[PDB]
Amino acid sequence: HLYPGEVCPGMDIRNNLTRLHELENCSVIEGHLQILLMFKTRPEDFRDLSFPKLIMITDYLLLFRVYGLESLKDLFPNLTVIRGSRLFFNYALVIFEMVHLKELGLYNLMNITRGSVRIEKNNELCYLATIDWSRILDSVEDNYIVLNKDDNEECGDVCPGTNCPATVINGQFVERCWTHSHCQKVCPTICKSHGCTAEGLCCHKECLGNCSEPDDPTKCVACRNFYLDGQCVETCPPPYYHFQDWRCVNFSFCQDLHFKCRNSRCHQYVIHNNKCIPECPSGYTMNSSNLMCTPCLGPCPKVCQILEGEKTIDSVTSAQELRGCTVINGSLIINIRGGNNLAAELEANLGLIEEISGFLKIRRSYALVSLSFFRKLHLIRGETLEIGNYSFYALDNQNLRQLWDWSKHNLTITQGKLFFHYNPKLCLSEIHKMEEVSGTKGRQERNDIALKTNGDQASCENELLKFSFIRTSFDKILLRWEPYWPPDFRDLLGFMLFYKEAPYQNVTEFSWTVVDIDPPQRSHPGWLMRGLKPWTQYAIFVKTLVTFSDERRTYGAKSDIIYVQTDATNPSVPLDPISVSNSSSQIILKWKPPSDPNGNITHYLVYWERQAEDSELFELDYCLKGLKLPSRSCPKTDSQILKELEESSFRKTFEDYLHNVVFVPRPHRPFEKVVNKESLVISGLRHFTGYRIELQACNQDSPDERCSVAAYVSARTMPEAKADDIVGPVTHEIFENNVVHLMWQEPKEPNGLIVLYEVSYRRYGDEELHLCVSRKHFALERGCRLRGLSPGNYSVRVRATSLAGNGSWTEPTYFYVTDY
């Protein structure tokens, strides 16, 4: 249930496990636990040693170079909470250079209240990616897990799936397991932080991590807010005072701690605001009899004597040593070599300091974006100055944009000069505003504030260029802006025009195609754009190019980003046009939308036309052998720009020298209209006929069509089954000299055309004889004519051949010729 045993204030273990046996009798650590520098150990030295009593650690846990420890699942099988009251370089769980370890095994760790986890230089550590840190840490982006076995190698990760819950981390679901036999326990979304039981029920509101019985304060293993007599409470009832932000104690305990510190070598505890804190804040003083700090009758701040008078701030733990300070009797150096914004915690720890007796220096702070975390910074006395007699040293800050909010923030610097260098996103305007506000205007000398490094990557020209005439065309946009001239008009070397496609309005500042425009002659400067894609929105703005002047302010002029969309035009030809004839009267036409819509495609145009059969085929004697009928760019940079700058400056220099020397100061077809469809069904088609299809993608219907050429495709319908069949009875004629002339009605409406006829006459008992009848043969002889037949009874069968294929035979016809 709750915490039994001792409290064991945080200890450190070194060089052996002989002293490690003092963690057996306590369940909660009121401090920090460090297991480190353990060289002469073997993996068999840790299996027999276990600490199931440990539940939570107040400050942090650090593991550094412990040899032989392969998994913490044996050492700490009941660790569930790391409060993180005091961190270790803004980290609450550090595992560094922990050789001979394969898996963490901390399968009961649920919540880390404050801090982050850094795991680094573990060549044998696995089962790292199989942990959902988002369920433990409020901010997972602050973690740092690099240089392990997971990325160096491909060690196996076998999470039991047949049970380990899976949650998406970036775009895919992966099972979560601490070890090969322990899944990461995941609570339902209803249980925010109070934890869930085995069957998945939310615990008590004042619970955290794990509980034995749901909705029971006395059956929890980690009180979320406070602990008192085995019960978690919102706040300590009287006469119990909040102590160490995790438990409540009586007046006797706080008094005993104060007396023990007073009568020995310390944290001389006091009482304030129903709490037993190490020291009461500014404006309060402890009394003789009681420990409460009553308000003082005067402005007495909490001075914080900095050792060596020069303190470097590089972490949350280093800044936390100034918590509650108001007047600093030393100097501050802000140096966060990070990459993640620490302003949230830095403003909580710092920002309550009013005056700085020394100098303030910000050096190589990559992650800082503003110095606004100094909420109540007013006076910088500067009684001790940086080398070179400086009282404010800003150098090489990669992302410093604003120093303070000068609308409501005041500042005062007594002595010392200023310094600013290599701040690519801090502009000279802010520096000069700080000069005016602070009161050190007439105190800086040359090169104390650089000009080519401050704000060289930020656009702060603080002067507006206004467009005067913009006109849009099919693929050309004409731009015109008001002319701008610096005081020395020869300094203006031209303009740069930045244009880029902008699908949506929100576009950044500072792709971005550049074109150089020569300055005008002294007629607005203007420029015309070539090669644009129709129906596209572009982001346009102009920033001037002027010559540097080393003495005074450089110059500034630029235009706000404007958005212009080019108009529409004729679209492109549809792609992939395919026509399929499923039926004799039905053809399905399929196509793709054009690759260059040039606007919104509103409709389509489909045109129909029948292909007349070739007259060549009607006039051929196909009975002849050989009747195989078909079965139907970066600027040259330095070697370039500089040269132009040098030439312009040389011309200006010669002009100035000439003026100095000269002047002396004396003393139709079927069609249809598609509506938002990419396919069409066509009916009313002649059987077995080839059609030419003219298909268009057209985006303007009522105010005249503005659309391009059409795609052409051919489609031929299926032939009918009985179109080639010969209809009508067969008529035969027998002359005096036994001449047979046949007469059969042709298939008047065939599959296109009939190429030939075949007559097969067989006498009873004889063999079958074939004859080919051609189109011209049929036209001339009106059917079939046979010469010189032997007497007997024959059987006449007729078939017709079309372009589709072979037609069926006719019914047998019998004729008998005289034997004379």
Partner: peptide
Amino acid sequence: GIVEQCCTSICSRYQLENYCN
């Protein structure tokens, strides 16, 4: 010379007769 007086600083009317007969 005249250039440092006029192009850098601000020139009024009076001194320009110092450059004339």
